[PDB]
Amino acid sequence: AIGPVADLKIVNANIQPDGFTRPAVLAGGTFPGPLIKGNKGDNFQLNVIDELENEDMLKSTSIHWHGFFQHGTNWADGPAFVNQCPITTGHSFLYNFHVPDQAGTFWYHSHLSTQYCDGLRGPMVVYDPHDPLKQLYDVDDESTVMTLADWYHTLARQEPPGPVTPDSTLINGLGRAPGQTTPSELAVLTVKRGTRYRIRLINISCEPNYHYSIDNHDLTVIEADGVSTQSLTVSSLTIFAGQRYSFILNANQPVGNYWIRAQPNDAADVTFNGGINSAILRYEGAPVAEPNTTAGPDNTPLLEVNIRPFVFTPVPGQPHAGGADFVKNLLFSFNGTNFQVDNVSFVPPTVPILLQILSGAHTAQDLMPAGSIIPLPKNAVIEFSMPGGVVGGGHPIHLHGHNFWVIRSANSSVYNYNDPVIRDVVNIGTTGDNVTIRFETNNPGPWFLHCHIDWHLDLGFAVVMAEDIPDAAAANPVPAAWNELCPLYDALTPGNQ
Ligand SMILES: *[C@@H]1O[C@H](CO)[C@@H](O[C@@H]2O[C@H](CO)[C@@H](O)[C@H](O)[C@H]2NC(C)=O)[C@H](O)[C@H]1NC(C)=O
Ligand SMILES: *[C@@H]1O[C@H](CO)[C@@H](O)[C@H](O)[C@H]1NC(C)=O
Ligand SMILES: *[C@@H]1O[C@H](CO)[C@@H](O)[C@H](O)[C@H]1NC(C)=O
Ligand SMILES: [Cu+2]
Ligand SMILES: [Cu+2]
Ligand SMILES: [Cu+2]
Ligand SMILES: [Cu+2]
Ligand SMILES: [Zn+2]
Ligand SMILES: [Zn+2]
Residue by residue, DSSP assigns 122-155 as EEEEEE-TT-TTGGG-SB-SGGGEEEEEEE-SS-
Residues 6+ apart with CB under 8 A from 402: 69, 424, 439, 440, 443, 447
Residue 169, CA atoms < 13 Å, CB-side half-sphere? 33
Instruction: Give the closest ligand to the alpha carbon of residue 345.
Output: 2
What letter represents residue 381's amino acid?
A: V
Q: Name the residue at shortest CA distance from atom 22 of ligand 1.
A: 329
H/E run at residue 456: helix 454-458
CA of 329 to the centre of ligand 1 (A): 6
Expressed in angstroms and rounded, the spacing between residue 297 Cα and the centre of ligand 3 is 16
Residues 94 and 113 in one domain: yes
Residue whose CA lies nearest to ligand 3 atom number 8: 411
How far apart (Å, rounded) are the C-alpha atoms in residues 108 and 32? 10
- The answer on 362 and 220 residing in a single domain is no
Q: Is the CB of 434 under 6 A from ligand 1?
A: yes
Q: Which residues line ligand 2 (CB under 6 A)?
A: 335-338, 345
Q: Is 358 helix (H, G, I), strand (E, B) or coil?
A: helix
* Phi, psi dihedrals of residue 468, rounded to the nearest 5°: 45, 50
Which helix or strand (DSSP H or E) is residue 339 part of? strand 339-341
Instruction: Name the residue at shortest CA distance from atom 7 of ligand 3.
Output: 411
How many angstroms separate the CA atoms of 81 and 95, rounded? 16
Distance CA 45, CA 371 (A): 35
176 and 306 together in one domain:
yes
Cα separation of 406 and 435, whole Å?
7
Q: Provide the CATH number for the domain around residue 354.
A: 2.60.40.420
Alpha-carbon distance 79 to 355, whole Å? 13
362 part of the active site: no
State the number of CA atoms in the 13 A half-sphere of 113 facing the CB: 16
The amino acid at 389: G
Pocket test for ligand 3, best of 411, 414, 431, 433 (most atoms within 8 A of CB): 411
Which of 71, 109, 211, 402 is labelled catalytic?
A: 109
Between CA 133 and CA 220 the distance in angstroms is 11
Q: How many CA atoms lie within 13 A of 40 on its CB side?
A: 12
Q: What is the dihedral of CA 259, 261, 267, 268, to 10 degrees?
A: 20
Bond preceding residue 4 cis, omega within 30 of 0? yes
Ligand 9 centre distance from Cα of residue 366 (Å) = 5
Query: What is the C-alpha separation between 390 and 403, in angstroms, rounded?
Result: 23
Which amino acid belongs to residue 59? K
Domain count, the chain: 3
CA distance 153 to 151: 7
Sheet with strand 43-50: strands edge to edge? 22-27, 5-15, 43-50, 92-98
Same structural domain, 219 and 248? yes
> Residues with Cβ < 8 Å from 466, sequence gap 6 or more?
353, 364, 367, 373, 374, 375, 376, 446
Domain boundary among 92, 112, 132: 132
109 in active site = yes
Q: Measured between alpha carbons, how far is residue 104 from residues 124, 128, 306, 488, 492 in Å? A: 9, 8, 19, 35, 38
CB 196 within 8 A of CB 217: no
Cβ neighbours around 347 below 10 Å, total: 13
Closest ligand 1 atom to Cα of 436: 2
Residue with CA at minimum distance from ligand 3 atom 1 = 411
Look up the domain containing 76 and give its range. Answer: 1-132
Contacts of 181 (CB under 8 A, 6+ apart): none
Atom of ligand 1 at shortest range from CA of 387: 27
Same domain, 324 and 240: no
Q: Which residues in the chain are immediately followed by a break of C to N over 2.5 Å?
A: none
**Residue 92: which of 31, 11, 204 has the closest Cα?**
11
Q: List all residues 6 or more positions away from 333 whose beta carbon is below 8 Å from its beta carbon.
A: 339, 340, 343, 390
Neighbour-count burial for 65-95, b at 16+ CB within 10 Å, e otherwise: bbbbbbbbbbbbbbbbbbbbbbbbbebbbbb
| Rounded CA separation 434/416 (Å) | 13
d(CA 386, CA 437): 8
SS3 assignment, position 287: coil
Do 204 and 32 touch, CB atoms closer than 8 A? yes
| 71 catalytically annotated | no
How far apart CA 122 and CA 33 sit, in angstroms, is 4
Same domain assignment for residues 147 and 239: yes
CA separation (Å) from 363 to 85, 409, 424, 465? 21, 33, 26, 12
Centre of ligand 5 from the C-alpha of residue 387, in Å: 21
Which of 132, 147, 174 is a domain's end point?
Answer: 132
Q: Looking at ligand 1, which residue's alpha carbon is closest to its atom 27? A: 387
- Of 36, 400, 437, 448, the catalytic one is 400
Asked if residues 209 and 300 have their Cβ atoms less than 8 Å apart, the reply is: no
Kindly provide the residue ranges of all beta strands, DSSP E only, lying in 160-290, ordered along the sequence: 168-171, 188-191, 196-203, 210-214, 219-224, 227-234, 237-239, 244-250, 257-264, 278-283
Does residue 224 sit in helix, strand or coil? strand
Give the Cα separation of 457 and 172 in Å (integer): 25
Residues 164, 125 share a domain:
no
- Dihedral angle, C-alpha 476, 385, 161, 18, nearest 10 °: 80
Dist CA 234 CA 253 (whole Å) = 16
| Cα separations in angstroms, 231 against 133, 248, 422 | 9, 9, 15
What is the β-pairing status of strands 373-376 and 422-423? unpaired
Would you call 66 a catalytic residue per the annotation?
yes
Q: Are strands 145-151 and 404-408 parallel, antiparallel or unpaired?
A: unpaired
Phi, psi of 366 (to 5 degrees): -90, -5
CB of 411 sitting under 6 A from ligand 3: yes
Number of C-alpha atoms within 13 angstroms, CB side, residue 27?
31
d(C-alpha 137, C-alpha 231), whole Å: 12
Catalytic residue among 71, 111, 211, 402: 111
Note whether 217 and 293 are within 8 A (CB). Answer: no
**468 bridge partner residues:** none
SS3 for 11? Answer: strand
Q: Among 311, 346, 381, identify where a domain stops.
A: 311
Alpha-carbon separation of residue 164 from 147, 152, 206 (angstroms)? 21, 9, 10
Are both 302 and 338 inside the same structural domain?
A: no
Cβ neighbours of 160 (radius 10 Å): 7
331 Cβ closer than 6 Å to some ligand 1 atom:
no
Residue nearest to ligand 1 atom 14, measured at CA: 322
Tell me if residue 395 is catalytic.
Answer: yes
**Position in ligand 3 atom list of the atom nearest CA 303:** 5
Q: Is 12 helix (H, G, I), strand (E, B) or coil?
A: strand
**410-425 b/e (C-beta count within 10 Å ≥ 16 → b):** bebeeebbeebbbbbb
* 339, 291: one domain: no
What's the CA gap between 329 and 110, in Å, rounded? 29
Q: Note the resolution in Å, 1 decimal.
A: 1.8
| Binding site membership of 430 for ligand 3 (Cβ less than 6 Å) | no
How would you classify the pairing of strands 462-467 and 445-451?
antiparallel
Q: Are residues 47 and 165 in the same domain?
A: no
Nearest CA to ligand 3 atom 13: 411
> Nearest C-alpha to atom 3 of ligand 2 is from which residue?
338
| Nearest ligand atom owner, CA of 411 | 3
For residue 391, give the nearest of 435, 450, 432, 332 by alpha carbon: 332
Q: How many angstroms is it from 59 CA to the middle of ligand 5?
A: 22
Alpha-carbon separation of residue 185 from 191, 212, 261 (angstroms): 19, 20, 15
Contact status, residue 257 vs residue 290, Cβ threshold 8 Å: yes
Instruction: Examine the domain organization and report whether 221 and 188 are in the same domain.
Output: yes
For ligand 1, whether the C-beta of 387 sits within 6 Å is: yes
Q: Does one domain contain both 300 and 152?
A: yes
Q: Are strands 445-451 and 339-341 parallel, antiparallel or unpaired?
A: unpaired
Technique used to solve these coordinates: X-ray
* Residue partners of 494: CB distance under 8 A and separation at least 6: none
C-alpha closest to that of 64 among 441, 439, 374, 457: 457
Three-class SS of residue 217? strand
Give exposure, 19-28, as e/b (b: 16+ Cβ within 10 Å).
bbebbbbbbb
Residue of 85, 395, 397, 448 with catalytic role? 395
Measured in whole angstroms, the distance separating CA 126 from the mean position of its chain's CA atoms is 15
